[PDB]
Amino acid sequence: SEREKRVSNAVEFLLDSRVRRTPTSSKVHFLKSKGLSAEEICEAFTKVGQPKTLNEIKRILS
């Protein structure tokens, strides 16, 4: 699906050896600007073992 193509790309970004050490807020805003929804950002973070709540993502993006 289109959603899972976005999430798969996001997982590759979050697993990057350099990206993983950058701030959460930078990663979240990056993924939003690439077109992920807040829910999709939650899924990507969960899939790399660092779950973020939906409301935390909403706060970062507000």
Automatic annotation (TrEMBL):
Record family assignment: Belongs to the peroxin-14 family.
Species this protein is from: Trypanosoma brucei brucei
Residue span, Peroxisome membrane anchor protein Pex14p N-terminal domain: 2-46
Residues of the full protein shown: 23 to 84 of 366
Chain's role: Component of the PEX13-PEX14 docking complex, a translocon channel that specifically mediates the import of peroxisomal cargo proteins bound to PEX5 receptor. The PEX13-PEX14 docking complex forms a large import pore which can be opened to a diameter of about 9 nm. Mechanistically, PEX5 receptor along with cargo proteins associates with the PEX14 subunit of the PEX13-PEX14 docking complex in the cytosol, leading to the insertion of the receptor into the organelle membrane with the concomitant translocation of the cargo into the peroxisome matrix.
Stated name of the protein: Peroxisomal membrane protein PEX14
Compartment(s) where it occurs, according to its Swiss-Prot or TrEMBL record: Peroxisome membrane
Domain of life: Eukaryota
